Amino acid sequence: NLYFQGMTRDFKPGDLIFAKMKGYPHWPARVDEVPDVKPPTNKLPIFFFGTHETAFLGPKDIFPYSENKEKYGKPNKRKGFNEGLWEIDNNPKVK
């Protein structure tokens, strides 16, 4: 996220996070390895737990998981969200 962890090199593959996208709650996710193309230069490859969807996101939309577990790690009605909360704590290497 902005200023606190605002560079792509603040994160590494395997790091667990909450990823934020417009219209959606902060979503349990992980940073993945770059696949591999011409990936966007100032973005990280993100895998979303529960839905298993993927995106490229900048550091501004990425929050460390542990620090934010109590604030963002609450059940949500969005489809796949609660399964995602299970994965991030119990199966964080699911592919």
UniProtKB/Swiss-Prot annotation:
Cross-link (Glycyl lysine isopeptide (Lys-Gly) (interchain with G-Cter in SUMO2)) at residue(s): 79
Post-translational modification: Citrullinated by PADI4.
Compartment(s) of residence: Nucleus
Tissue and organ distribution: Widely expressed. Expressed at high level in the thymus. Expressed in fetal and adult brain. Expressed in neurons, but not astrocytes. Markedly elevated in fetal as compared to adult brain. In the adult brain, expressed in the subventricular zone (SVZ), in hippocampus, and undetectable elsewhere. In the fetal brain, expressed in the germinal neuroepithelium and cortical plate regions.
PWWP domain sequence ranges: 7-68
Assembly notes: Monomer. Interacts with IFRD1/PC4. Isoform 2 interacts with SFRS1. Isoform 1 interacts (via IBD domain) with POGZ (via IBM motif) and CDCA7L (via IBM motifs). Interacts (via IBD domain) with KMT2A (via IBM motifs) with a moderate affinity whereas interacts with the KMT2A-MEN1 complex with a greater affinity; MEN1 enhances interaction of KMT2A with PSIP1. Interacts with fusion protein KMT2A-MLLT3. Interacts (via IBD domain) with IWS1 (via IBM motif), MED1 (via IBM motif) and DBF4 (via IBM motifs).
Sequence similarity: Belongs to the HDGF family.
Task of the protein: Transcriptional coactivator involved in neuroepithelial stem cell differentiation and neurogenesis. Involved in particular in lens epithelial cell gene regulation and stress responses. May play an important role in lens epithelial to fiber cell terminal differentiation. May play a protective role during stress-induced apoptosis. Isoform 2 is a more general and stronger transcriptional coactivator. Isoform 2 may also act as an adapter to coordinate pre-mRNA splicing. Cellular cofactor for lentiviral integration.
Linked pathology: A chromosomal aberration involving PSIP1 is associated with pediatric acute myeloid leukemia (AML) with intermediate characteristics between M2-M3 French-American-British (FAB) subtypes. Translocation t(9;11)(p22;p15) with NUP98. The chimeric transcript is an in-frame fusion of NUP98 exon 8 to PSIP1 exon 4.
Protein name: PC4 and SFRS1-interacting protein
Lineage: Eukaryota, Metazoa, Chordata, Craniata, Vertebrata
Gene: PSIP1
Residue numbers of the full-length protein present here: 1 to 91 of 530
